[PDB]
Amino acid sequence: MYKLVLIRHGESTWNKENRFTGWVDVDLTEQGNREARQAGQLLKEAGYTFDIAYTSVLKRAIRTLWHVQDQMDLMYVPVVHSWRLNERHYGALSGLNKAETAAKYGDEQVLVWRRSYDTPPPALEPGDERAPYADPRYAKVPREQLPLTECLKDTVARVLPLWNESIAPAVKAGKQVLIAAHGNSLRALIKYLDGISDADIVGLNIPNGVPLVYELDESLTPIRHYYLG
Numbered sequence: 001m002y003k004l005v006l007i008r009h010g011e012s013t014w015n016k017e018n019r020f021t022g023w024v025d026v027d028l029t030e031q032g033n034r035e036a037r038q039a040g041q042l043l044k045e046a047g048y049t050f051d052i053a054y055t056s057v058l059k060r061a062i063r064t065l066w067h068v069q070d071q072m073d074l075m076y077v078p079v080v081h082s083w084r085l086n087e088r089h090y091g092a093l094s095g096l097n098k099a100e101t102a103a104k105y106g107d108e109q110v111l112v113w114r115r116s117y118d119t120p121p122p123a124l125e126p127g128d129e130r131a132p133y134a135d136p137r138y139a140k141v142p143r144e145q146l147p148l149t150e151c152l153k154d155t156v157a158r159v160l161p162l163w164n165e166s167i168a169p170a171v172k173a174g175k176q177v178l179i180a181a182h183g184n185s186l187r188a189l190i191k192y193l194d195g196i197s198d199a200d201i202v203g204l205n206i207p208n209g210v211p212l213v214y215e216l217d218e219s220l221t222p223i224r225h226y227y228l229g
């Protein structure tokens with residue numbers, strides 16, 4: 001039997017401002033820093049340790065990981081930063097206030113853009129300042145693999161290779177793994193782990209900064225899961 005711990009980044013500036021974020025590299029609020037430290041303290045007091053961690057290339061998740069590491073006295077473990085764990089790409093919605101958007105386009109249209117498993121937000125133009133092509137984070141990524149928008153389906157497809165190629169072999173090698181990531185990239189990973197239907201995944205929400213523990217059997221199939229706290 002194995003344990004895997006997942007954690008969503010603490011409150012970001014745009015979470016506070018109610019803006020769609022996606023791949024925009026915004027940072028934690030004071031609250032979010034607090035949440036991350038509390039999560040690290042909660043794992044420390046429960047006796048968890050880790051041998052490796054996975055995160056995105058986005059600072060809100062990385063700083064969350066840093067606070068956890070600092071509270072646990074785990075500043076030295078290897079960390080794999082992967083674009084594959086980035087938040088779902090919000091396209092031309094990135095940066096817009098969610099309430100303003102719903103007023104302009106309607107509540108239903110926004111709920112389709114936010115939670116339709118299969119229908120993506122309107123795309124960035126390839127010339128937009130928000131596009132990923134000139135960002136050093138993505139300099140070794142095939143141009144054709146870089147998104148201009150994503151639905152959860154695309155996010156699931158992007159997350160899986162990192163699971164199959166790196167995280168699952170670590171878990172099988174006996175490494176105690178922590179994944180510090182994002183609301184929709186953790187929804188996507190959960191969807192895969194728990195074998196959740198396209199319909200059923202629509203109502204799953206992940207709070208900021210709360211450890212989510214998975215117990216996994218010999219074939220890495222979930223036995224049970226629970227939040228700590």
Ligand SMILES: O=[P-]([O-])[O-]
Pocket residue numbers: 008009012015021022087181182183184
């Ligand atoms: O707001 P977040 O889950 O990237």
